[PDB]
Amino acid sequence: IVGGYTCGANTVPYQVSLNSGYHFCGGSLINSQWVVSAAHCYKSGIQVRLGEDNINVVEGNEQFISASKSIVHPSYNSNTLNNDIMLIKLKSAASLNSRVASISLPTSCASAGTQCLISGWGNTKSSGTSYPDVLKCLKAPILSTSSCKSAYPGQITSNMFCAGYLEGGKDSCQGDSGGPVVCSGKLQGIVSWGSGCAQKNKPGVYTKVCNYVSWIKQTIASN
Amino acid sequence: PTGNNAEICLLPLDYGPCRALLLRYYYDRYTQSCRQFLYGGCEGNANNFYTWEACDDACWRIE
Ligand SMILES: [Ca+2]
């Protein structure tokens, strides 16, 4: 997250880190046994790490649970990034407490102008790279469909939205993929892609979770 | 020339536009060696291999 701020320990209790020896992507816990992330984060060997703040030290009260299943959306297209969503099933249920808690799925789509919270352990620089120890947060509004398509002509599908600041300085970045975009206490978005990070007229692009609630519920039911 | 290893091996690293940190390998022409990088998960270019071995084999000889 570029241009954001230190969340504080366990203030985003649904944020997870996806580990394959190292943190490769984030994720959102939607119930005791299931995490939502991005399809481009797919890996056969994932360990979900819940209740993290500093991902570089083991404090002793995190929960580290293997993923038993990682199910990418069946219509995911790796060239267009359409349907960039994946569900991860935990081997065993997490213990929910104040530091590990699920986030609700949306019951409507969020409109342009709504403020969201975007979070993750990604790059905090727009030039070069610096990866933080502790979780970073950014407040950002949903952008209008018109301004998103203007920014990225020919690239925005119906299952994508833009959020952030067209002036630059504040965006999600590499290392944040798969993490949450939360508006009014619902999961409205998944970190996906952008042209660079925190650049002028190139806002973050996010998977529109409200479009997938049926798929999410039936995947969970059937697996 | 066709199947030309230089056309792949001599390209600069490209993290691409997706926002992951996936461990991959690339040929670095200034060290003449296969090095690791963290790929964003989509697009980029062909100088992008899953393993050091794959890179080493692909870039074994450069004309
Ligand atoms: Ca930790």
A44 & A80 share domain: yes
Q: Which of A21, A24, A197 sits opposite B20 (nearest CB)?
A: A24
The DSSP letter of residue B11 is S
H or E element that contains B55: helix B52-58
Structure tokens at A98: 């104040």
State the SS3 of chain A. CECCEECCCCCCCCEEEEECCCEEEEEEEEECCEEEECHHHCCCCCEEEECCCCCCCCCCCCEEEEEEEEEECCCCCCCCCCCCCEEEEECCCCCCCCCCCCCECCCCCCCCCCEEEEEECCCCCCCCCCCCCCCEEEEEEECCHHHHHHHCCCCCCCCEEEECCCCCCCECCCCCCCCEEEECCEEEEEEEECCCCCECCECEEEEEHHHHHHHHHHHHHHC
Q: Say whether both A91 and A129 belong to one domain.
A: no
Q: Residue A211 is which amino acid?
A: N
Rg (CA), chain A: 16
3-state secondary structure of B57: helix
Strands A180-183, A23-31: parallel, antiparallel or unpaired by DSSP? unpaired
Q: How far apart are CA B18 and CA B31, in angstroms?
A: 27
Domains of chain B: 1-63 (4.10.410.10)
Asked whether A39 and A72 are in contact (CB, 8 A), the reply is: yes
| Chain A: closest CA distance from residue B23 (Å) | 8
Residues A174 and A188 in one domain: yes
Number of independent structural domains in chain A? 2
State which H helix or E strand residue B53 sits in: helix B52-58
Question: Taking a C-beta distance cutoff of 8 angstroms, is the pair A161, A142 a contact?
Answer: yes
Contact A4, A15 (CB under 8 A): no
Contact A117, A12 (CB under 8 A): yes
Measured in angstroms, how far is the CA atom of residue A129 from the centroid of ligand 1? 21
Q: Which residue, among A18, A40, A85, A130, would best test binding to B if mutated, counting the most B CBs under 10 Å from its CB?
A: A40
A172 and A119 co-located in one domain: yes
Tell me: do A96 and A107 sit in the same domain: no
Q: Which two tokens stand for residue B8?
A: 């792949």
Which of these, A42, A44, A86, lies nearest to A66 by C-alpha position? A44
Looking at the structure, do residues A26 and A84 belong to the same domain, yes or no? yes
Specify the amino acid at residue A4.
G
Residues of A involved in catalysis: 40, 84, 177
Beta bridge partners of A117: A139, A182
Sole residue written with tokens 């074994």: B60
Q: How far is CA A149 from CA A20, A62, A95, B44, B63, in A?
A: 34, 40, 41, 22, 42
Q: What is the resolution of this structure in A?
A: 1.8
Same domain, A94 and A192: no
Residue to substitute from B13, B15, B19, interface A, most A β-carbons within 10 A: B19
Domain residue limits at A188: 1-12+103-210
Contact A174 B42 (CB under 8 A): no
Q: Is B15 in the A-facing interface, judged by CB distances under 8 Å?
A: yes
Q: How far is A205 from chain B (nearest CA, A)?
A: 9
CA distance A45 to A32: 20
Tokens representing residue A51 in the block: 């209740």
Does any CB of chain A come closer than 8 Å to the CB of residue B20?
yes
User: Is there a binding annotation on residue A57?
Assistant: yes
| Secondary structure (DSSP) of B17-50 | SB---EEEEEEETTTTEEEEEEE-SS---SS-BS
Q: Are residues A68 and A175 in the same domain?
A: no
Half-sphere exposure of A197 (CA within 13 A, CB side): 31
Q: Tokens 């798929």 correspond to what residue? A: A215
H helix or E strand, kind and range, residue B62: none
CATH number at residue A217: 2.40.10.10
Query: What is the helix (H) or strand (E) element at residue B58, kind and residue range?
Result: helix B52-58
Quote the distance between the C-alpha of residue B54 and its chain's center: 10
Q: Give the count of beta carbons closer than 10 Å to the beta carbon of residue A219.
A: 18
Q: CA-nearest residue of chain A to B19?
A: A174
Does A180 lie in the same domain as A129?
A: yes
Q: How many CB pairs under 8 A join A and B?
A: 59
Under 8 Å between Cβ of A31 and A152: no
Q: How was this structure determined?
A: X-ray
A193–B17 CB contact, under 8 Å = yes
Looking at residue B10, the DSSP 8-state letter turns out to be T
